[PDB]
Write a protein that binds this ligand. Sequence first.
Ligand SMILES: NC(=O)C1=CN([C@@H]2O[C@H](COP(=O)(O)OP(=O)(O)OC[C@H]3O[C@@H](n4cnc5c(N)ncnc54)[C@H](OP(=O)(O)O)[C@@H]3O)[C@@H](O)[C@H]2O)C=CC1
Ligand SMILES: NC(=O)C1=CN([C@@H]2O[C@H](COP(=O)(O)OP(=O)(O)OC[C@H]3O[C@@H](n4cnc5c(N)ncnc54)[C@H](OP(=O)(O)O)[C@@H]3O)[C@@H](O)[C@H]2O)C=CC1
Lengths: 303, 302
Amino acid sequence: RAPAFLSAEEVQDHLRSSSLLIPPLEAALANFSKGPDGGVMQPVRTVVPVAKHRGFLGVMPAYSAAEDALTTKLVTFYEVPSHQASVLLFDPSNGSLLAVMDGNVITAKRTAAVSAIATKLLKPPGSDVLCILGAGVQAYSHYEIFTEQFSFKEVRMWNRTRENAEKFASTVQGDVRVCSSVQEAVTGADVIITVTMATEPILFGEWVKPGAHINAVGASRPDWRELDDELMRQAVLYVDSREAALKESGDVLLSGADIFAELGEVISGAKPAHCEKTTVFKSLGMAVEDLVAAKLVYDSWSS
Amino acid sequence: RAPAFLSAEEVQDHLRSSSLLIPPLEAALANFSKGPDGGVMQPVRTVVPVAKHRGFLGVMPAYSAAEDALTTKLVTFYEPSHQASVLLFDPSNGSLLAVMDGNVITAKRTAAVSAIATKLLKPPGSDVLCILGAGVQAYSHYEIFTEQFSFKEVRMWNRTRENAEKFASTVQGDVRVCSSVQEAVTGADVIITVTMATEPILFGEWVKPGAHINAVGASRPDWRELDDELMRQAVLYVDSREAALKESGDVLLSGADIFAELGEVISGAKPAHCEKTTVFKSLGMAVEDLVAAKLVYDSWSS
Ligand SMILES: NC(=O)C1=CN([C@@H]2O[C@H](COP(=O)(O)OP(=O)(O)OC[C@H]3O[C@@H](n4cnc5c(N)ncnc54)[C@H](OP(=O)(O)O)[C@@H]3O)[C@@H](O)[C@H]2O)C=CC1
Ligand SMILES: NC(=O)C1=CN([C@@H]2O[C@H](COP(=O)(O)OP(=O)(O)OC[C@H]3O[C@@H](n4cnc5c(N)ncnc54)[C@H](OP(=O)(O)O)[C@@H]3O)[C@@H](O)[C@H]2O)C=CC1
């Protein structure tokens, strides 16, 4: 019995709303951070660079006992969407390949879903203003769930090329104030989302409102950065994975910042959410997050 | 852009002649052993323990600049023991071109790489071949070794003699079934170990001076097929030093010195001591899976 293939449109049908992903992801992150008592086996992501094409192949395997599912997501990103992904789903009991599915929409919706979880815990009292840095796939996915989950009075956006932000602004529903600089976009912003593939810092702490929350999603490479030192050093730093951040996050590696806690620890109440101080959630993506989503799809697909 | 799926039989048809599999395997091994300047990017394999089901998931990604190929092998082994899938990507844009069964590929390249080491390291007058084990790898090894070499006597030992006899009357030529490892390896010139043994079964005291051993089995850091004596007194060749020092219980638990990588011998950097007793420890490498995958895909897309 050959494995089933699930198209991008097959997946989204059996995926449904991005915020429906939230409670299972909350469980996955907590289980992960619980370590040996959490049932999650997840080594740090293996990345092989394709220098000849300025690209990378990410391989993210995971087993999760609670979901009893065995997965591997393979993602290529190059500096045809920039990010291409496929998820493999195995029978954890015998090991046969069950399904090969398009991983792009899972990646987009799950990443947005995790940022929202961290945002819900860490956004300051009186979070009226949201700012989005970037205008790619993740920006759309984050915009959809953040306007769904939260109630911002104003949304700002900056992109490297202003045309794509204005395009973004006119495509999405609801008003978007396109700003020509990051300084303008984040000034007075209570929640900031950085979803660019920049490699040198675009976000400087001096522009950041005291107590603001930052979701740093991009710069998933040891030599890449989105944030400067002042922000990385002065803010309370949360990550999805401590082992992954110390190996793959240039924002963490180069700044020399102390990781305060893993987001899963907070979810379980093992660590506090300092919503009143300036916070940074540095997200690098974890295989267990993909696991949960792909498991939801196949199970739906099977019924 | 839905990926292609090649069945095991489909892969099996694209890999008929070994006379097309070994030359690119040799080239790949040569380039790998050169390090990064050789153009092969191959992280040590990641293994996910699934003790909950007494099983493992092996993950083996690779890129090669020389043939511009980007692949990932995903192997699962449980207690068909080994189930593999090989993914082939487009290097320039990252799209997944194909998903193929990787059990046939695994069997083929493993047997072929062993034959490459054997062709180089077998002693003068190699008349007796000895196979320890009777699984998938024993078959694939037997087919290529009898095609490539010319032994007068082929022997086999297996933990379950029933399986050894089923092997003996399935393969074409005459295989002599033995009731002990010592009986099988005594006087043997080439020895192939493809067992799931976790504690030493092959002992240096039994091994003919000058014999070549292809140790393929034990690929977990606490499992081993060969004893301290043999590991330390033979000239030790591996596919990868980095994998060996991580995953080979045979090498780690004996403190044995690695003389060379196989690619180093193919390239000319290190000599093939065919007159000394030699051991080639194969752990399996992502680039070997890559080579086969590209060969299959090139033929398939023609
Ligand atoms: N943490 C996680 O879980 C995951 C993280 N990501 C990361 O997030 C980022 C966005 O992903 P995605 O939306 O799919 O990619 P996209 O290609 O769809 O979007 C790229 C965005 O980043 C901008 N960009 C590219 N280079 C630069 C640069 N040098 N400087 C400033 N902006 C730049 C682009 O702007 P422009 O219009 O000028 O091209 C665009 O706004 C990536 O870096 C990705 O690696 C996504 C996967 C999940
Ligand atoms: N180096 C490489 O490139 C790769 C290495 N391998 C490794 O090679 C070995 C064989 O692979 P494969 O043929 O596919 O596996 P199989 O399941 O097809 O065959 C298993 C063989 O090992 C024997 N065996 C099981 N337990 C023991 C034991 N305690 N002692 C001695 N023999 C035992 C079995 O005998 P019985 O008849 O009793 O079952 C059988 O002969 C494995 O260890 C595998 O991990 C395979 C992938 C490629």
